[PDB]
Amino acid sequence: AGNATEVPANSTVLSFCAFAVDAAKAYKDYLASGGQPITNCVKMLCTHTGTGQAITVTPEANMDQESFGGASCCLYCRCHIDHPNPKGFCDLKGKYVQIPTTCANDPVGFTLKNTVCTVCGMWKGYGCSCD
């Protein structure tokens, strides 16, 4: 035997979110007490000069952007739990995420906080110039 896919560093934080009625606050309240961020997230050697958009089915990125694997940033999918949306379908699974390169280290964090805008297709407030 059986193939293994996790490091001993992620043992504690994955165990916390597994038993959690509020997985959102649970992870947020881990980083709150300075727990180290979730590690070994899939990453993409993106050509890095491309159309900047929130989530994309094809790899793309800008100078200010960093492209990630989709199923890796869903804390739910990463922790193997149910998705609190309807249709029970993760939206992230199926696309590439483009994080702004400043908070690029903890990618699971960002998706928990800000969502996409459906007027231009950018993460609202981080370049979604709908001034």
Partner: protein, 512 residues
């Protein structure tokens, strides 16, 4: 190593995963990996037809977060919370076809002797989300476990067994405590079983109540205490301890079987939970009474203790004033509290061990029948709440009957039971062989208080000059009825009183 066993793929497929639909850097297949960083070739299409099994084996709960309490507790507070110990042992099966490399909880045994047989369900990965469905399973090979042959072939969906876990727990611990301390032995593939019915979070409060929160419901988002949990599914915030880490050697059945001689079974998961509890009960409370860990009041504690003190102050005074004993022996009283200060006997202190005070010259001895059969021949020996195998021929013995079950008398080790009432007393098994030299005591009431001036009571059990006369006085009727209340309440509590062979109730009459 630097690679764990949690979430290990149990898939029987050779290939690995696309960039998307892949959890971690290791779950991505080997094809894309150029410069430690995957790249999406246009060619290989990502899968739409796959189900794949995830190994929920080997959790680890070793955090300290600012708001959430700890699952794993210490023995210090575990000993203070003895009203909440529920054994837990599971027995799973191996994943066999189209998967391999994990185990699925099949039989769930709890200390209250209720098995649960559950259809094998594991968490399985899909191209859309994760799922909770059946798995192909084969009972492990062995002549140790064989009764598992038709057990797998029948099974209750996991949603129905979650209701029974709360249905069971909420019945026992409803009026014993407000928490649950799961005692485990293996600590591993028991946490895997707890994934199926446990939830933890910040400390909430029971809606429609005022207590702590200890039960979860995912239909109506409300959390309940025990008495108000009807219809809920998950368990809230449990606590768990592991016995093997207390410095034990080797496997399980041996080390329990040094003390007890009853616990055993074929291999039933219920009989595993009983031994695991009997181990900690022995290990912790069988050779001391700490006197320093007080316990909360559940019910009738004050009244039961007061009645016990009253009857003890009563019977010993009656016996001494009847038989004119020169010397009175006393065994087992930690400190020196004279039950009847207004006596003539010399009250020597045949205590088990010196307890925090040398002021009243308490001496030290342990009592056994074969050792002290001919040591004490003068007067009568007071064995109040003693634990000796056999009592001598001149004794006033008040031994707790362990065959009576109540919210006060928890089950214990070696047939003996744990009587937790403001303190923890581990009395051994109540056997008739201990009272071969003794007899039961009749009920009576003897007071020297002068009579002063309603329903008339005519009972020869009470001994006063007023009732010896034709008319019974209101200065003794109420005392008689209150003593009767105390006596019946304490016998219902479970204490059993024994007196020497030569006890005569008529010898009290001529004292008047």
């Amino acid at each position: 190593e630097n690679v764990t066993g949690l979430f290990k793929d149990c898939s029987k497929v050779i290939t690995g995963l696309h960039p998307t639909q892949a959890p971690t850097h290791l779950s991505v297949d080997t094809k894309f990996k150029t410069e430690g960083l995957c790249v999406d070739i246009p060619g290989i299409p990502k899968d739409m037809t796959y189900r794949r099994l995830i190994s929920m084996m080997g959790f680890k709960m070793n955090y300290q977060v600012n708001g959430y309490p700890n699952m794993f507790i210490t023995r210090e507070e575990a000993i203070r919370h003895v009203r909440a110990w529920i054994g837990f042992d599971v027995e799973g099966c191996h994943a066999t076809r189209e998967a391999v490399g994990t185990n699925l909880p099949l039989q769930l045994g709890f200390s209250t002797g209720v098995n649960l047989v559950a259809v094998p369900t594991g968490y399985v990965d899909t191209p859309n989300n994760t799922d909770f469905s059946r798995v192909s399973a084969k009972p492990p090979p062995g002549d140790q476990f064989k009764h598992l042959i038709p057990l797998m072939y029948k099974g209750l969906p996991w949603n129905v067994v979650r209701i029974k876990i709360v249905q069971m727990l909420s019945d026992t611990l409803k009026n014993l405590s407000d928490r649950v301390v799961f005692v485990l032995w293996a600590h591993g593939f028991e946490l895997t079983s707890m994934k199926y019915f446990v939830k933890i979070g910040p400390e909430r409060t029971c809606c429609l109540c005022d207590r702590r929160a200890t039960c979860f419901s995912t239909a109506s988002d409300t959390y309940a205490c025990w008495h108000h949990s009807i219809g809920f599914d998950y368990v809230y915030n449990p606590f768990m301890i592991d016995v093997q880490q207390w410095g034990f050697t080797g496997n399980l059945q041996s080390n329990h079987d040094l003390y007890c001689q009853v616990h055993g079974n074929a291999h039933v998961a219920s009989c595993d939970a009983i031994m695991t509890r009997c181990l900690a009960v022995h290990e912790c409370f069988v050779k001391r009474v700490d006197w320093t860990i007080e316990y909360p009041i559940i019910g009738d504690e004050l009244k039961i203790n007061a009645a016990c003190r009253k009857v003890q102050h009563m019977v010993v005074k009656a016996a001494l004033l009847a038989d004119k004993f020169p010397v009175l022996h006393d065994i087992g009283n930690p400190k020196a509290i004279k039950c009847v200060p207004q006596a003539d006997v010399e009250w020597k202190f045949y205590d088990a061990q010196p307890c925090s005070d040398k002021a009243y010259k308490i001496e030290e001895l342990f009592y056994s029948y074969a050792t002290h059969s001919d040591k004490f021949t003068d007067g009568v020996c007071l064995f109040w709440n003693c634990n000796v195998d056999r009592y001598p021929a001149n004794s006033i013995v008040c031994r707790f009957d362990t065959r009576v079950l109540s919210n006060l008398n928890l089950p214990g080790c070696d047939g003996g039971s744990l009587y937790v009432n403001k303190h923890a007393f581990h009395t051994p098994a109540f056997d008739k062989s201990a009272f071969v030299n003794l007899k039961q005591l009749p009920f009576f009431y003897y007071s020297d208080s002068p009579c002063e001036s309603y329903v008339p009571l005519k009972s020869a059990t009470c001994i006063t000059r007023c009732n010896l006369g034709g008319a019974v006085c209101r200065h003794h009727a109420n005392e008689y009825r209150l003593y009767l209340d105390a006596y019946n309440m304490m016998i219902s509590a479970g204490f059993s009183l024994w007196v020497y062979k030569q006890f005569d109730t008529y010898n009290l009459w001529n004292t008047f």
